[PDB]
Amino acid sequence: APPTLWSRVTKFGSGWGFWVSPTVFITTTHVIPTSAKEFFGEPLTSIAIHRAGEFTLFRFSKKIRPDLTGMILEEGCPEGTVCSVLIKRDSGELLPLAVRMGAIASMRIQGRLVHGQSGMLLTGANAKGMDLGTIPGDCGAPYVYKRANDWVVCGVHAAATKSGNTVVCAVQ
Amino acid sequence: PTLWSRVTKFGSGWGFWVSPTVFITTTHVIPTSAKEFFGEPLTSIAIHRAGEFTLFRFSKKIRPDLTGMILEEGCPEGTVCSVLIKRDSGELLPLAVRMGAIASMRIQGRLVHGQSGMLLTGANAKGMDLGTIPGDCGAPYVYKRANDWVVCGVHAAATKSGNTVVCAVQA
Numbered sequence: 018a019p020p021t022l023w024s025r026v027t028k029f030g031s032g033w034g035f036w037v038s039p040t041v042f043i044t045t046t047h048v049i050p051t052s053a054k055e056f057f058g059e060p061l062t063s064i065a066i067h068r069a070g071e072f073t074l075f076r077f078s079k080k081i082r083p084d085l086t087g088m089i090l091e092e093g094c095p096e097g098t099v100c101s102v103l104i105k106r107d108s109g110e111l112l113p114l115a116v117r118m119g120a121i122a123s124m125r126i127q128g129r130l131v132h133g134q135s136g137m138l139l140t141g142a143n144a145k146g147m148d149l150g151t152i153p154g155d156c157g158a159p160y161v162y163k164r165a166n167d168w169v170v171c172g173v174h175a176a177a178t179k180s181g182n183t184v185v186c187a188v189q
Numbered sequence: 190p191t192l193w194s195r196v197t198k199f200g201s202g203w204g205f206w207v208s209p210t211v212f213i214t215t216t217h218v219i220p221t222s223a224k225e226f227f228g229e230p231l232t233s234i235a236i237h238r239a240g241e242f243t244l245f246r247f248s249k250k251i252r253p254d255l256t257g258m259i260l261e262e263g264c265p266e267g268t269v270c271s272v273l274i275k276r277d278s279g280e281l282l283p284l285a286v287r288m289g290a291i292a293s294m295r296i297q298g299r300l301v302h303g304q305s306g307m308l309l310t311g312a313n314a315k316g317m318d319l320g321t322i323p324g325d326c327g328a329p330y331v332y333k334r335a336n337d338w339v340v341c342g343v344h345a346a347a348t349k350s351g352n353t354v355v356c357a358v359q360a
């Protein structure tokens with residue numbers, strides 16, 4: 018995946034977030050530090066925070082990542098799109114996990130009620146564990162795929178099943 | 190703490206540490222001019238070649254940090270393996286491959302012998318991280334069975350289309 022997409026993936030709370038543009042940051046609601054009143058020098062009052070369940074979008078009043086171009090964010094992707102989940106792991110290792118995306122689903126995962134776009138990992142048969150699958154630290158990592166000439170971001174990692182094979186992408 | 194630390198850059202491709210003393214790789218990626226590997230003089234390195242499968246056994250522990258893993262001669266037909274691809278970008282690309290028959294295949298001219306497989310990543314990559322490239326040769330094929338990781342060979346070749354892969358196997 019292009020170095021410009023990896024540059025957007027930022028360590029955030031208990032996981033990650035993704036810079037869509039110099040002013041727009043998206044992440045999984047449950048990774049957000051709950052008592053936080055300041056982000057990248059900016060007070061709460063000066064940021065527009067839009068929340069739909071496990072999807073959260075921050076719009077800043079000043080450019081935080083002016084090195085970046087604005088890119089397309091969509092509400093999930095067509096069934097059967099193959100996406101890459103842009104996961105960073107211990108030691109500047111980059112893990113773009115291949116996922117075939119399915120239907121919008123409501124599920125119960127480790128007792129918690131989750132809603133988003135469902136997907137099945139294409140890494141291996143029994144992908145439980147950090148080698149072929151996701152870990153809780155990966156939440157907020159973006160789901161991306163290439164169209165004609167460009168890349169699209171369509172959501173953020175919200176959950177995975179006990180088996181590891183199914184993942185859920187929270188969507189705008 | 191990981192399968193991925195066993196995947197090592199080597200010659201024109203990659204290899205895999207099965208134990209502290211045992212390294213496996215694709216024959217065609219090995220340097221043809223050398224007096225040592227991993228600082229060990231070739232003097233003291235046992236080399237077992239079988240077509241596109243090569244095993245090295247060292248006289249001392251090169252990777253004492255590792256436990257020994259199960260190495261088998263291919264896997265049962267229809268096993269879904271993972272090819273653990275390392276790229277010079279810093280990317281790790283585990284791709285699912287449905288394994289088939291032992292066969293000889295015409296793969297871009299040459300005949301290659303080993304266990305055939307097909308990538309389960311879809312039709313074509315189209316410039317996404319979904320297929321193998323020539324530089325990936327030597328990457329290991331692994332699957333989980335009970336609590337155990339099994340390695341059953343090394344990436345020897347892929348078709349133009351990317352669809353078909355050849356896993357070179359022991360013996």
Ligand SMILES: O=C(NNc1ccccc1F)c1ccno1
Binds near residue numbers: 310
């Ligand atoms: O075999 C393929 N698909 N179906 C399948 C996958 C796993 C187990 C049983 C199956 F029938 C295949 C080859 C290449 N792309 O899809």
